[PDB]
Amino acid sequence: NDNSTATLCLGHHAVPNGTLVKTITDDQIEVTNATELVQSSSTGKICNNPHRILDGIDCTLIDALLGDPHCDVFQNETWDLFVERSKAFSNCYPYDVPDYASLRSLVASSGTLEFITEGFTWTGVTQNGGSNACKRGPGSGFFSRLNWLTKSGSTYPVLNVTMPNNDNFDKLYIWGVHHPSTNQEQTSLYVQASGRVTVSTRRSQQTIIPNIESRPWVRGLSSRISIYWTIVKPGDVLVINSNGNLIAPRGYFKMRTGKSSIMRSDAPIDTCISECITPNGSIPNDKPFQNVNKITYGACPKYVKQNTLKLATGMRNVPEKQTIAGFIENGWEGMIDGWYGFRHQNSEGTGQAADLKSTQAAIDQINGKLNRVIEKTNEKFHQIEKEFSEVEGRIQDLEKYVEDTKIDLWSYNAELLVALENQHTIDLTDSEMNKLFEKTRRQLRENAEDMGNGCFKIYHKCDNACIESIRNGTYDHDVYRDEALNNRFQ
Amino acid sequence: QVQLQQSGPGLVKPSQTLSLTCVISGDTVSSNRAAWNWIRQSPSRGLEWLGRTYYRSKWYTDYAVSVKSRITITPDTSKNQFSLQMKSVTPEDTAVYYCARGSAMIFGIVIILESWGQGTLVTVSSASTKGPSVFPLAPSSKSGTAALGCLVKDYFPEPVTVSWNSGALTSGVHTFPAVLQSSGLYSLSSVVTVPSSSLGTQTYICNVNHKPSNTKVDKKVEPKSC
Amino acid sequence: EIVLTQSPGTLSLSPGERATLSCRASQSVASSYLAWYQQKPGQAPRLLIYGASSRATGVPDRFSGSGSGTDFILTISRLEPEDFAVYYCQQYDGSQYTFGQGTKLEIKRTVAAPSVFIFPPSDEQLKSGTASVVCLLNNFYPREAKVQWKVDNALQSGNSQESVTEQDSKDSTYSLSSTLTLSKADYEKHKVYACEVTHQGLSSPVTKSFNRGEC
Ligand SMILES: *[C@@H]1O[C@H](CO)[C@@H](O[C@@H]2O[C@H](CO)[C@@H](O[C@@H]3O[C@H](CO[C@H]4O[C@H](CO)[C@@H](O)[C@H](O)[C@@H]4O)[C@@H](O)[C@H](O[C@H]4O[C@H](CO)[C@@H](O)[C@H](O)[C@@H]4O)[C@@H]3O)[C@H](O)[C@H]2NC(C)=O)[C@H](O)[C@H]1NC(C)=O
Ligand SMILES: *[C@@H]1O[C@H](CO)[C@@H](O[C@@H]2O[C@H](CO)[C@@H](O[C@@H]3O[C@H](CO[C@H]4O[C@H](CO)[C@@H](O)[C@H](O)[C@@H]4O)[C@@H](O)[C@H](O[C@H]4O[C@H](CO)[C@@H](O)[C@H](O)[C@@H]4O)[C@@H]3O)[C@H](O)[C@H]2NC(C)=O)[C@H](O)[C@H]1NC(C)=O
Ligand SMILES: *[C@@H]1O[C@H](CO)[C@@H](O[C@@H]2O[C@H](CO)[C@@H](O[C@@H]3O[C@H](CO[C@H]4O[C@H](CO)[C@@H](O[C@H]5O[C@H](CO)[C@@H](O)[C@H](O)[C@@H]5O)[C@H](O)[C@@H]4O)[C@@H](O)[C@H](O)[C@@H]3O)[C@H](O)[C@H]2NC(C)=O)[C@H](O)[C@H]1NC(C)=O
Ligand SMILES: *[C@@H]1O[C@H](CO)[C@@H](O[C@@H]2O[C@H](CO)[C@@H](O[C@@H]3O[C@H](CO)[C@@H](O)[C@H](O)[C@@H]3O)[C@H](O)[C@H]2NC(C)=O)[C@H](O)[C@H]1NC(C)=O
Ligand SMILES: *[C@@H]1O[C@H](CO)[C@@H](O[C@@H]2O[C@H](CO)[C@@H](O)[C@H](O)[C@H]2NC(C)=O)[C@H](O)[C@H]1NC(C)=O
Ligand SMILES: *[C@@H]1O[C@H](CO)[C@@H](O)[C@H](O)[C@H]1NC(C)=O
Missing domain, CATH: 2.60.40.10 (Immunoglobulins)
Structure with a gap:
């Protein structure tokens, strides 16, 4: 009928708009606080700094290497990252490289196109052949770095040109062999019925016999040129023998070992600062994973198939609504200091305070979770990369499918490890809440009783000082026992 | 922010x-x-x-x-x-x-x-609020830089803002913490260290504001001679 | 409630050395709920460390926090003259915030001799009835300095108040302003007003004076 008794309710933190996280028991649990681990967003544009980026607007790396006329701006050009656009084309004598990707990767790894000419002596043979496929400027022309040798008078002799190497770096020589389409064309240019081109250093030799066939029409020609490369090391010599069909080099390309590479993309370039480059823009390397693209350049996160991986750093987020009760029905949106709290209602009035001994016990465990996830996924990443490298024996020709299943197995383990910690986080947070309800029940003993809604009903008058005695670990029930039992049993 | x-x-x-x-x-x-x-x-x-x-x-x-x-x-x-x-x-x-x-x-x-x-x-x-009374602290013959200032006196309550040339003067300024006189009123001093050659050509103005009394005084400090 | 006690109450250090400030608690404190603040003279407290060990936005690696239970420590590794302030530890217990008494950290400097100036009373003030003559020490270290007022070679006691400035955050020096207040009538009776200054950076006490009137 009056202020004879008081109420002490237990509750926890709660917010209206929580975050959904994955666990093992549930597919999605709304928690109070979490963080995103994948970088699915991107500015869209590529950042010009800190790496030296080179936009090959219309010219591929090979075309700029060889000397396609519209690529002549790229001479001696250097780069940290060469980018190739989709629009890039070739407009020069039709050709083909047997090891295109191998040569493209070799020259890309060296961040330079530094070419120096050399004084080859092609005696008895006319130099600087030309084609109207590459008109160069007003007149006919050819590749910049290639010397097309054609017969002189009515004689094309056997050329044996030697060229030693007396430098500390490695030289890269690019040359070619011309494949005419008729025997008439072969005789007119080279006199001989059948040619040869031989290039060697030391043990290595390459010997190519030209093939007279009619190829698919390109730029008014059914003839083609095959491009080969040859590396000479310090102290080595380059010897070139040919009785015909020789597309000679002008010099060599000085290649340096470096951290350069190449990637195909159409993303625009902008003035910004980004460490990690992806074909669809630049992304910040602050998150552990990224969904933006598979191929990247620079210090980048790991690639992940799914566009979301959230690590729970809170507790079960149950909200409030409509219409006092504790944690059985709804959390407390008003309690913001800590994840476990007390509320009460006594003669003095309603009050509230957080329990930091249990909140700290949860925080101290959640503290090193993100770092723990990063250490484990990194080990599993380089594990899945170390193994899964062999692939049950390999065939270069048809491995397109292996990366598609590497990403799946890696994404499965990563999403599983995040779900392992989220389960552990939900477990330990709910544990500290139930342990608090046990500590208070034990403390009150027969002086109160569980009301069923996460609260107690203290059957004696318990002022704010008495309530703080319950929150503190110092509450003697024996002194209030006689008073509370009098009210009980009545 | x-x-x-x-x-x-x-x-x-x-x-x-x-x-x-x-x-x-x-x-x-x-x-x-x-x-x-x-x-x-x-x-x-x-x-x-x-x-x-x-x-x-x-x-x-x-x-x-x-x-x-x-x-x-x-x-x-x-x-x-x-x-x-x-x-x-x-x-x-x-x-x-x-x-x-x-x-x-x-x-x-x-x-x-x-x-x-x-x-x-x-x-x-x-006690009643009271505004200040600004007095100049002109410099004399050199002793190699000179020093001038102001003496804001007899005000209540705290606190008084003192700027120089409407915030244009920052280097060398020393506004001192007030001292409570036996009168139950406050006294304050603010001095500037300035090159001796800078006098005459340039003028230094002492901006004093005491919100509790709603006073904004500005005294020009100039060297006195004979 | 919980009470925070900071030791030492005052700390003097030379630049480059390391400061360690301890924060003692009556009762055990949650490690996540103990913060440290910096209050430069005339400004509001600026957050440095929160959650015992976590650096706020805009503070260098020199500031680092540590501790648990009733013992928390704040260390400043590479001191600078700019780090002069009063540092407080703060805790939260549930329903209340609590602060410590603070640790006054003043940075040592090589001794600097003061520049003495003396200003006679303004003629405008004399018409009002009182007369304030001002003596000024400028940019010196350390803070310990003594001013002796002499009127006609007669020591004065109890008619003078002095004010010392806070340690400059750049040059790390002090500044004193001793003022001697007389009546107008009492001011005219005497004629030569001197200001004796004793300081460590001075081999012998300095006396700046002016014969009353001028020129
Ligand atoms: C889980 O819990 C954590 C905290 O424990 C939450 O993390 C914080 O979330 C808030 C979200 O608002 C973040 O605050 C935002 O910071 C942005 C970046 O601030 C930088 O720039 C300012 C100004 O230069 C600097 O002062 C600051 O130090 C940073 O360098 C701001 O751009 C945001 O501003 C917007 O909101 C504020 C109101 O807060 C407005 O005043 C602004 O005008 C603007 O609208 C905002 O301040 C905060 O940085 C996050 N981290 C921390 C450590 O606090 C998670 O959000 C939470 N996750 C959940 C609930 O899912
Ligand atoms: C957990 O919570 C309990 C319950 O609140 C705490 O114990 C109570 O402490 C308060 C004081 O905070 C006691 O209430 C009253 O305090 C008087 C002293 O008041 C001082 O207040 C300020 C400091 O805050 C001083 O500046 C001021 O000058 C006063 O000196 C006490 O003297 C009174 O207690 C009386 O009764 C107790 C027995 O109950 C006697 O032991 C005392 O000697 C005195 O006679 C007054 O009641 C309150 O009494 C305390 N309750 C109990 C049951 O002890 C715990 O301290 C707290 N523990 C922790 C670890 O946080
Ligand atoms: C994220 O980035 C990746 C990588 O950048 C994007 O994936 C790629 O997207 C492109 C589409 O943009 C895919 O298609 C490719 O584009 C080709 C473009 O078609 C053009 O082809 C010729 C240009 O080479 C044009 O004809 C040319 O003919 C001669 C040269 O022979 C020349 O002289 C003439 O002037 C003319 O230019 C032709 O007319 C046409 O305009 C397209 O043909 C072909 O389908 C290509 O495959 C590409 O496959 C994607 N690659 C990968 C690995 O995914 C991705 O889309 C980006 N995503 C987002 C969201 O931004
Ligand atoms: C790309 O770099 C190469 C070399 O790294 C440049 O080719 C050669 O450059 C040298 C000078 O560095 C030229 O030699 C010069 O000869 C003149 C006389 O003709 C002489 O007076 C100079 O002192 C110097 O010795 C050399 O001729 C040149 N070779 C060719 C074939 O041009 C090349 O110019 C660079 N290209 C670009 C676009 O930067
Ligand atoms: C290359 O040019 C001339 C052909 O007249 C010959 O020169 C020889 O070159 C080889 C290359 O290893 C040397 O070992 C010989 O000592 C050279 N001999 C002379 C006399 O110069 C050589 O016959 C030709 N090389 C080949 C392999 O045909
Ligand atoms: C966020 O809060 C609003 C009301 O403030 C509510 O309508 C909405 O459903 C909440 N969002 C979620 C995901 O529950």
């Missing part, structure tokens, strides 16, 4: 009611991510948290026990501010009062006061 601006430093007589306001700029008072605290600081009591107020689909207010009875913190949404009232003030309530915002920093919790106001000194005294 919130900006908190508080009311004017003034005087409130004994047993009256203290009343300040904090006008928030760059955030809302009804923010679901912030809590607005009042803190006072005095030499006798130190830094003392007074209370706070935050909105979580409902207006919650918490108060310290030492001040629970005589205080009321009320938020005003329409002007985006929140005020502090303290009643039956006593001479122990003379302090600098700080508007400060608290925001959770650890996993969505652990509120921490990170954005602070400038702080407004309030004196609880049964």
Whole structure:
């Protein structure tokens, strides 16, 4: 009928708009606080700094290497990252490289196109052949770095040109062999019925016999040129023998070992600062994973198939609504200091305070979770990369499918490890809440009783000082026992 | 990047009611991510948290026990501010009062006061307010730089702002902390160190402002000769 | 409630050395709920460390926090003249915030001799009835300095007040302003007003004076 008794309710933190996280028991649990681990967003544009980026607007790396006329701006050009656009084309004598990707990767790894000419002596043979496929400027022309040798008078002799190497770096020589389409064309240019081109250093030799066939029409020609490369090391010599069909080099390309590479993309370039480059823009390397693209350049996160991986750093987020009760029905949106709290209602009035001994016990465990996830996924990443490298024996020709299943197995383990910690986080947070309800029940003993809604009903008058005695670990029930039992049993 | 601006430093007589306001700029008072605290600081009591107020689909207010009875913190949404009232003030309530915002920093919790106001000194005294009397401190023959200043005297209550050339002079300025004379009034001095050649060609103006008395004086300091 | 006690109450250090400030607690404190603040003279407290060990936005690696239970420590590794302030520890217990008394950290400097100036009273003030003559020490270290007022070679006691400035955050020096207040009538009776200064950076006490009137 009056202020004879008081109420002490237990509750926890709660917010209206929580975050959904994955666990093992549930597919999605709304928690109070979490963080995103994948970088699915991107500015869209590529950042010009800190790496030296080179936009090959219309010219591929090979075309700029060889000397396609519209690529002549790229001479001696250097780069940290060469980018190739989709629009890039070739407009020069039709050709083909047997090891295109191998040569493209070799020259890309060296961040330079530094070419120096050399004084080859092609005696008895006319130099600087030309084609109207590459008109160069007003007149006919050819590749910049290639010397097309054609017969002189009515004689094309056997050329044996030697060229030693007396430098500390490695030289890269690019040359070619011309494949005419008729025997008439072969005789007119080279006199001989059948040619040869031989290039060697030391043990290595390459010997190519030209093939007279009619190829698919390109730029008014059914003839083609095959491009080969040859590396000479310090102290080595380059010897070139040919009785015909020789597309000679002008010099060599000085290649340096470096951290350069190449990637195909159409993303625009902008003035910004980004460490990690992806074909669809630049992304910040602050998150552990990224969904933006598979191929990247620079210090980048790991690639992940799914566009979301959230690590729970809170507790079960149950909200409030409509219409006092504790944690059985709804959390407390008003309690913001800590994840476990007390509320009460006594003669003095309603009050509230957080329990930091249990909140700290949860925080101290959640503290090193993100770092723990990063250490484990990194080990599993380089594990899945170390193994899964062999692939049950390999065939270069048809491995397109292996990366598609590497990403799946890696994404499965990563999403599983995040779900392992989220389960552990939900477990330990709910544990500290139930342990608090046990500590208070034990403390009150027969002086109160569980009301069923996460609260107690203290059957004696318990002022704010008495309530703080319950929150503190110092509450003697024996002194209030006689008073509370009098009210009980009545 | 919130900006908190508080009311004017003034005087409130004994047993009256203290009343300040904090006008928030760059955030809302009804923010679901912030809590607005009042803190006072005095030499006798130190830094003392007074209370706070935050909105979580409902207006919650918490108060310290030492001040629970005589205080009321009320938020005003329409002007985006929140005020502090303290009643039956006593001479122990003379302090600098700080508007400060608290925001959770650890996993969505652990509120921490990170954005602070400038702080407004309030004196609880049964004495009348009084403006100052500015006097020049002209320099004489050189002793290799000269020194001039001003003497702001006989004012109440604290505190007085002193600028030079309307904020254009910063290097060499030394505004001293006030001394409480036996009169129950305050005296203050502010000097500038300046090259001897700079005199004559350039003029130095002493800008003095004392809000509690609503006085804005500006005295030109010039060397006297014969 | 919980009470925070800071030791030492005052700390003097030379730049480059390391400061360690301890914060003692009556009762055990949650490690996540103990913060440290910096209050430069005339400004509001600026947040440095929160959650015992976590650096705020805009503070260098020199500031680091540590501790648990009733013992928390704040260390400033590479001191600078700019680090002069009063550092407080703050805790939260549930329903209340609590602060410590603070640790006044003043940075040592090589001794600097003061520049003494003396200003006679203004003629405008004399017409009002009082006369304030001002003596000024400028940019010196350490703070310990003594001013002796002499009127006609007669020592004065109790008619003078002095004010010392806070340590400059750049040059790390002090400045004193001793003022001697007399009546107008009492001011005319005597004719030569001197200001004796004793300081460590001075081999012998300095005396700046002026014969009353001028020129
Ligand atoms: C957990 O919570 C309990 C319950 O609140 C605490 O114990 C109570 O402590 C309060 C004081 O905070 C006691 O209430 C009253 O305090 C008087 C002293 O007041 C001082 O207040 C300030 C300091 O805040 C001083 O500046 C001022 O000058 C006063 O000196 C006490 O003297 C009174 O207690 C009386 O009764 C107890 C027995 O109950 C006696 O032991 C005392 O000697 C005295 O006679 C007054 O009641 C309150 O009494 C305390 N309750 C109990 C049951 O002890 C715990 O301290 C707290 N523990 C922790 C670890 O946080
Ligand atoms: C889990 O819990 C954590 C906290 O424990 C939450 O993390 C914080 O979330 C808030 C979200 O608002 C973040 O605050 C935002 O910071 C942005 C970046 O601030 C930088 O720039 C400012 C200004 O230069 C600097 O002062 C600051 O130090 C940073 O360098 C701001 O751009 C945001 O501003 C917007 O909101 C504020 C109101 O807060 C407005 O005043 C602004 O005008 C603007 O609208 C905002 O301040 C905060 O940085 C996060 N981290 C921390 C450590 O607090 C998670 O959000 C939470 N996760 C959940 C609930 O899922
Ligand atoms: C994220 O980035 C990746 C990588 O950048 C994007 O994936 C790629 O997207 C492209 C589409 O943009 C895919 O298609 C490719 O584009 C080709 C473009 O078609 C053009 O082809 C010729 C240009 O080479 C044009 O004809 C040319 O003919 C001669 C040269 O022979 C020349 O002289 C003449 O002037 C003319 O330019 C032709 O007319 C046409 O305009 C397209 O043909 C072909 O389908 C290509 O495959 C590409 O396959 C994607 N690659 C990969 C690995 O995915 C991705 O779309 C980006 N995503 C987002 C969201 O931004
Ligand atoms: C790309 O770099 C190469 C070399 O790294 C440049 O080719 C050669 O450059 C040298 C000078 O560095 C030229 O030699 C010069 O000869 C003149 C006389 O003709 C002499 O007076 C100079 O002192 C110097 O010795 C050399 O001729 C040149 N070779 C060719 C075939 O041009 C090349 O110019 C660079 N290209 C670009 C676009 O930067
Ligand atoms: C290359 O040119 C001339 C052909 O007249 C010959 O020169 C020889 O080159 C080889 C290359 O290893 C040397 O070992 C010989 O000592 C050279 N001999 C002379 C006389 O110069 C050589 O016959 C030709 N090389 C080949 C392999 O045909
Ligand atoms: C966020 O809160 C609003 C009301 O403030 C509510 O309508 C909405 O459903 C909440 N969002 C979620 C995901 O529950």
